[PDB]
Amino acid sequence: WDREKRLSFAVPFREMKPVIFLDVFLPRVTELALTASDRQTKVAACELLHSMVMFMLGKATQMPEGGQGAPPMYQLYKRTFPVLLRLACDVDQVTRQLYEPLVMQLIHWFTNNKKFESQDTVALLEAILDGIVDPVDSTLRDFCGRC
């Protein structure tokens, strides 16, 4: 999902500081989050993905790259936002309470004055719109509307 591997984590051992790339986890973690059967697995995955998307936002603000091309983590946002969306307004009450507020918070952030212009907001809006048009996920429509 990304040419070069952002989401650099530094799992903080004591005797050393190795780096673990959280992006490689993500494409499978998200699939778990949407469609896992065992609900313990699903809720655990959802809580991981909440943590991980929060990390995306964080590593974004520690901008390593101020534009001059595709914004960093845009490529990641494009494919994590539809996940975040249709995983909100899922029909697990726990996931719903966990992600509906976060999607609202994300929408909030992505019209904060700082980087109101950025392609990241462009992408998120594009995601919401392709969320409206969603053919099958009937209930996704309503949350996308509220979004």
């Binding site: 040419r3 070069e4 490689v24 494409p27």
Partner: protein, 413 residues
Amino acid sequence: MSDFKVEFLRNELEIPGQYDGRGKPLPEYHVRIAGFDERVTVMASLRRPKRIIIRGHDEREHPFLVKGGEDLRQDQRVEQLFQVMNGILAQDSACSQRALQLRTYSVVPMTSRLGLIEWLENTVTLKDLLLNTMSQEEKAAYLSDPRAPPCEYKDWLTKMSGKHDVGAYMLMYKGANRTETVTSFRKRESKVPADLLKRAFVRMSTSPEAFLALRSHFASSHALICISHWILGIGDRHLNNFMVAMETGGVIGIDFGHAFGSATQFLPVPELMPFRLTRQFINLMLPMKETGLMYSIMVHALRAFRSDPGLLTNTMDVFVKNWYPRQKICYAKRKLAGANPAVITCDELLLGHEKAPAFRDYVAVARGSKDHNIRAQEPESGLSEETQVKCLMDQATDPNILGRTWEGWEPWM
């Protein structure tokens, strides 16, 4: 262009070239022109095309690479032939098992001197990809290193009695023994970094489970495109002219400013390369070798094409409009029926230019030495697909014929 506003008393313009005859159109769906943005950029090549960005009915863009000055009708027709080509590939079972498909792109000849070409979104130029992956250190080794020509080549012209930049090749073919040229070519190729595309892909694929797939797919795409081009799409394989789809790994044919024959009839840039099998592609299948996946898929493809030749032979009669076409099509049918690719290229030279002082040595180069080139052993006609492909391989990858090729057609990549 600046002030297009959708207005009455004006028939709405639908985005050029949005029809493909696999079914009744549903003509309402097609996106139609709705004004188009600024920021046209050029593509940095001779006959500078530029890159319009048309936005339409749906607010999703549609870049179309406006391009002029050429009788694009050639490109349109050749793209249509790949279309039928891809059909013939699909209709077989053996080939379809591996899901081979050339990728076509809409060519819409707008007039005698203009025609849009749909930009393939999310793709990069092969030499662009290559140069992009190389380390900034060695990047200077192509931009400018002590061997000022990308690898020693333009300088080595002088070493081969060639003084000036253009046309000096017209002299080297005289005294070029099978050794000093070949040894030089080995050297220059060696200097160029190895494990290039391999590095690019390793960067591309997530987990080693994916590298093998993407490699098979790149190899298949480049293979099929190569063979199909040998059928007709010869010539002008500048490393700008092979696009590689970052998204999916396909190798997509790009330019066809010279179709079949148009490569080698045009004397000032004599070309004896039927394929593009230069080093970095070989080195890709590193632990394997050429004649690994690639040769097999060659065999399969060519066997497919010859199954019902009329479908492709007696389709390129679109050259209705002596006659050069009446004979280039003849070369085509000869090769499809099966001729020593050396023989067909030699005939191409013989018709190409009999007035130059080289066509003795040109023909000699094409044929290749009997001792160490497996092309020269086969009969001029009546070839079996196995033999045809294998001979064509050697003719493509032969160090000798490669090494003396045109600068620009970067034979080392």
